[PDB]
Design a protein around this ligand. Structure first.
Ligand SMILES: [Mg+2]
Ligand SMILES: [Mg+2]
Ligand SMILES: [Mg+2]
Ligand SMILES: [Mg+2]
Ligand SMILES: [Mg+2]
Ligand SMILES: [Mg+2]
Ligand SMILES: [Mg+2]
Ligand SMILES: [Mg+2]
Ligand SMILES: [Mg+2]
Ligand SMILES: [Mg+2]
Ligand SMILES: [Mg+2]
Ligand SMILES: [Mg+2]
Ligand SMILES: [Mg+2]
Ligand SMILES: [Mg+2]
Ligand SMILES: [Mg+2]
Ligand SMILES: [Mg+2]
Ligand SMILES: [Mg+2]
Ligand SMILES: [Mg+2]
Lengths: 50, 109, 191, 139, 175
RNA sequence: UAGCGACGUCGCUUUUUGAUCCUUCGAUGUCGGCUCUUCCUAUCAUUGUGAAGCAGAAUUCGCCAAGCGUUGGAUUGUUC
RNA sequence: GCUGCGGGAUGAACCGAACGCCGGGUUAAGGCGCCCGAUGCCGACGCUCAUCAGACCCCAGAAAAGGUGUUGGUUGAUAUAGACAGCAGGACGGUGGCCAUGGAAGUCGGAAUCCGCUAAGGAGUGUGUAACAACUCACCUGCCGAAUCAACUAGCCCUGA
């Protein structure tokens, strides 16, 4: 299962920030949902671990 | 941090550098890559007796001795100065024996 | 606030020889030649220096968005100069669970054919870009190396691979399976 | 590209406005859209005019930044802008356009007779030369 | 005010009428930016009624004069203190303009406050106009124009819509 | 703040009911059902997706989305 | 109502203006891409891009709230004694200090907490070995080159719709 490769796959699919209003996956450092459908809010939450 | 505060923040290093300014001929230009372990005491303890080793930010020391010089010379330790982690044991002792003891006497010795 | 003449400084090394006919940039080097079309950007391009090859990218007036634009030309010319000297190399370790993933190169380095992909029966035939080669690397478990000149084409190929390997209707915090980009680098090392 | 950009002390032509046909020299730029211009010898008094008003040309001077009428006149006379201005094809074009506007009927009559004579000579010699080109390419 | 055309600077002095309770009132002075002297005389009463116990029937306007520009051929730097009044509430503002004369600077101020903040000629009171020296202009536009050896071309300059006939076989070579 | 959310608070809708009497009292045939066509989306299912206190399954909440479906019966005249 | 006329496309009530029939001239309210008469001005200054733009009293549909979309503005805090992020160095010692002996040698938990060396180290923010350990953060120094950071406010536009 190779935990370094697990770190790589979790880097590509786990540690993202999810916006509470637009529900889009963004980036681990991002502050704002880039979508027009909510309008660039600063309302986020981290993506849930197992 | 309000300039001097007469406390130990900014112009106490700019009291020590400029008040340990009238006791020496020969800043020595000791520089080490890392001192995180007991290398700090390896700098001071072996060179005690005449134990000095004082220099803060080289960014602090750009216009510092220029504006508070009044010593004419020893500003020929100019732009060869800033670069590199330099510790400055400014001394008053005999000849090159100081550098000779440091030519290795802290990191492997 | 309608600024004036922002200018970016692009050094050019000794091996590559640049030649522009307008906003169309044509660069020659050891590893093939290259060109792009910067027509829609409206920025002064000029080069100066007898065999020193300094390039300046200059935009007058503008807006804040266009002062943001004037750095992007500099960065793309930097990436083209890195590519035409060295070339770009993407190293991808395939991360597989209880099922293996078989990856073959079907024809001439272009076509990539992915199989067995969590036990799916569907053979996944993916067509890469023109101007980029792909090889299963040696001395490493299921590492896949893509080599090319244009970084947009090479990384679009890598994106096509990692979006070909995408898990449907499951958790994607479990089932961490796919072919992902692990390392970005140059063709010739130590440079 | 952009061979001619404005500067402190670059001469300029005034196309549309109250000063059509008169050179000015640019003293300094006020803010992006107008500038202070001045003419010592071309009879135009120191004032601020827009940039889309003025038409740029290629002669420069050497001014101090925001100098007086005196130093503008000194550099003007020492650079000899007027004679060198009349000795370019641009002013020849302007002169020809003014003469064509200031023609009369007898002038147009002479223009048409000279025009017919020239175009007949052109037609004959062009036909002879292209016939000779055919005879040259015939072997 | 309607701020029509170009502005003019008036120096206007005036006082209250002499009563037996007070001979010789202090005879105040203001600096009014107005399209003409009539709007100057009205705007003078508008400011002086806010500042002191004065109104138009109570006193008199003694002198009303045009202020000719002290240095017209110079390119000056002006600081304006604005008291515009927005939809929500009033504010304070310090703007800078690089321009020839004081009247032109205040005209640029009215036009720019009409353009940016949608403040009409109602809500704008001009507190103080100060010719400020170079290198103390706070604003980055006037700061970037503070340079000698200034170079810029005129890029993409297009003009003369239909000064030709509406039909031609030329397609214009802008620059 | 996955899903909900009191104490408060700002709206939208005319598919509930109410208020008004502006139109017709020298008449606009009044409930419900049968049949039949089209439209809306504030999506129940299907296509493509994102999030879960989503291991799988089964669910729940969102988004683009009205193309195509949304039945057979006992009762009551029923809408329900 | 009892009233036409010029604008608001369309109208009872709006905005100008009230009527005999006509020729010339001027304007009002409004307007000047083309319907449709007039900007076919070498008009002046800025703002805003909308994947549902916006476009004129009455007026014929929109708010609370939010935006590192941009544009101003206010109040503070840093920057020549070099910030700001970026690359490079470290991140101790008296001291395996102390509660424990389930670990704890700063890393689940508890009280606390001083000093020295200095360039600065928090009797240690955390990563991770169940724990020992590399490692980072706080804090510090080099290369760097001139503005940067934090709140708050209102115009347009967007979400809310
Ligand atoms: Mg499932
Ligand atoms: Mg009725
Ligand atoms: Mg009724
Ligand atoms: Mg009837
Ligand atoms: Mg009937
Ligand atoms: Mg009927
Ligand atoms: Mg249908
Ligand atoms: Mg009646
Ligand atoms: Mg009456
Ligand atoms: Mg009437
Ligand atoms: Mg009408
Ligand atoms: Mg209407
Ligand atoms: Mg009608
Ligand atoms: Mg008439
Ligand atoms: Mg009118
Ligand atoms: Mg017309
Ligand atoms: Mg905003
Ligand atoms: Mg809207």
């Amino acid at each position: 299962i190779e935990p370094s490769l697990r770190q790589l796959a979790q880097k590509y699919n786990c540690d993202k920030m999810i916006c509470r209003k637009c529900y889009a996956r963004l980036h681990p450092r991002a502050v704002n949902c880039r979508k027009k459908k909510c309008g660039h809010t600063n309302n986020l939450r981290p993506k849930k671990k197992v | 941090m309000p300039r001097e505060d007469r406390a130990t923040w900014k112009s106490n290093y700019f009291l020590k550098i400029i008040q340990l300014l009238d006791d020496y001929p020969k800043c020595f230009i000791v520089g080490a890559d890392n001192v995180g372990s007991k290398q700090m005491q390896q700098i001071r303890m072996s060179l005690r007796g005449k134990a000095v080793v004082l220099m803060g930010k080289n960014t602090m020391m750009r216009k510092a001795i220029r504006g508070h010089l009044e010593n004419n010379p020893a500003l020929e330790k100019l732009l060869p100065h800033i670069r590199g982690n330099v510790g400055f044991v400014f001394t008053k002792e005999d000849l090159t024996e100081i550098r000779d003891m440091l030519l290795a006497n802290k990191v492997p010795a | 606030m309608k600024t004036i003449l922002s200018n970016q400084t692009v050094d050019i090394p000794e091996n590559v020889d640049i030649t522009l006919k307008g906003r169309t940039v044509i660069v020659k080097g050891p590893r093939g030649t290259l060109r792009r079309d910067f027509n829609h950007i409206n920025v002064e391009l000029s080069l100066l220096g007898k065999k020193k090859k300094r390039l300046r990218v200059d935009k007058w007036w503008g807006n804040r968005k266009e002062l943001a634009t004037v750095r992007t030309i500099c960065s793309h010319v930097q990436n083209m100069i890195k590519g035409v000297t060295l070339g770009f190399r993407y190293k991808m370790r395939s991360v597989y669970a209880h099922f293996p993933i078989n990856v073959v190169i079907q024809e001439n380095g272009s076509l990539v054919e992915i199989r067995n992909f969590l036990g799916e029966k569907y053979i996944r035939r993916v067509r890469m870009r023109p101007g980029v080669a792909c090889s299963v690397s040696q001395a490493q478990k299921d590492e896949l190396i893509l080599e090319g000149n244009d970084i947009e084409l090479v990384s679009n190929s890598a994106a096509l691979i990692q979006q070909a390997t995408t898990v449907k209707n499951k958790d994607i915090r479990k089932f961490l399976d796919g072919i992902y980009v692990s390392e970005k680098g140059t063709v010739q090392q130590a440079d | 590209v952009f061979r001619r950009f404005v500067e402190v002390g670059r001469v300029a032509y005034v196309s549309f406005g109250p000063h059509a046909g008169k050179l000015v020299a640019i003293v300094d730029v006020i803010d992006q859209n107008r500038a202070l211009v001045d003419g010592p010898c071309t009879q135009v008094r120191r004032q601020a005019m827009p940039f889309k008003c003025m038409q740029l040309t290629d002669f420069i001077l050497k001014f101090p930044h925001s100098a007086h009428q005196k130093y503008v006149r000194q550099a003007w006379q020492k650079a000899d802008i007027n004679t060198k201005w009349a000795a370019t094809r641009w002013a020849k074009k302007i002169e020809a356009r003014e003469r064509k506007a200031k023609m009369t009927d007898f002038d147009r009559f002479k223009v048409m007779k000279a025009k017919k004579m020239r175009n007949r000579i052109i037609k004959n010699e062009v036909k002879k030369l292209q016939k000779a080109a055919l005879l040259k390419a015939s072997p | 005010m309607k701020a029509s055309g170009t502005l003019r600077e008036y120096k206007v002095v005036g006082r209250c009428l002499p009563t037996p309770k007070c001979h010789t009132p202090p005879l105040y002075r203001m600096r009014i930016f107005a399209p003409n002297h009539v709007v100057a005389k009205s705007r003078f009463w508008y400011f002086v009624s806010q500042l002191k116990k004065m109104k138009k029937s109570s006193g008199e306007i003694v002198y009303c004069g045009q202020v000719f520009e002290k240095s017209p051929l110079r390119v000056k730097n002006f600081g304006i203190w604005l008291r515009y009044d927005s939809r929500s509430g009033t504010h304070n503002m310090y703007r800078e303009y690089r321009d020839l004369t004081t009247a032109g600077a205040v005209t640029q101020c009215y036009r720019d406050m009409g353009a940016r903040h949608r403040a009409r000629a109602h809500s704008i009171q001009i507190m103080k106009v100060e010719e400020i020296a170079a290198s103390k202009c706070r604003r980055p536009a006037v700061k970037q124009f503070h340079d000698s050896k200034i170079k810029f071309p005129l890029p993409h300059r297009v003009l003369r819509r239909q000064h030709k006939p509406r039909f031609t076989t030329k397609r214009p070579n802008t620059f």
